Amino acid sequence: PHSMRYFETAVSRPGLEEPRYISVGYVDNKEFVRFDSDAENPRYEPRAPWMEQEGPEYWERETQKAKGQEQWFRVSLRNLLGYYNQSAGGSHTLQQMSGCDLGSDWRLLRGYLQFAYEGRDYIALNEDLKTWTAADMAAQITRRKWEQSGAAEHYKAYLEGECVEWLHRYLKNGNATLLRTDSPKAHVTHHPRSKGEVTLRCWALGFYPADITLTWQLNGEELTQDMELVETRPAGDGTFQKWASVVVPLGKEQNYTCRVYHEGLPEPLTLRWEP
């Protein structure tokens, strides 16, 4: 399985004609291109090494598309001000996510088109790529307008066509980096907690991709409802970090084992506190 997504944000700037618009492309959850209207000379830039394989014609065409989107978001932002009886003079945000997932059979598994206003669900294209799910009353206005205009067909065509074509290309071009792993480096630390009780923390560092599972066991059972699991966070060098901790009786630390599961590990790691 594999995916391409563009994540777009327009933020209105009070008194100003143009919003700030940012578009970020992802393949398999790795940022690979970015456009930002706030630059001196706004242009799409590569964000993954393997996008060096595209020539100047690619960057020109995609740059022109971004400026088109910026205008589409400008007009939409104004329309939304009216739907919600909002005064101008404040900032508002409009976001879009779109793209496609490929299955293991390498065909289109699903296409996506979703919009959010003020960080809340607004309208989405249904999986059928024909009907819309409008989140509130204002969005029903848009749903009816897009049904009237037959907007969905145009989106369907991109998602089943150009989205799939380009994701295949990016996967081929980026194969050697996108298909790689960096298995976690793991260790257990030991910490004071409270009277007669200590914390064991099982660390996983420098891993890629970000998907991972950490578990703790006592007497052959997972501590499902009894561990603190930190949110996965970037190391800042392209790899990720996570940890899982448990509070345990002082003197019983050796009864606990941490397991680490990751694509880069043929067999899961089994770890313990080692004083």
Binding site: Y58, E62, K65, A66, L80, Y83, K145
Partner: peptide, 10 residues
């Protein structure tokens, strides 16, 4: 290569 939205705005 990203989607150009339908000429129809929100």
């Amino acid at each position: 290569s990203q989607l150009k939205n339908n000429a129809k705005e929100i």
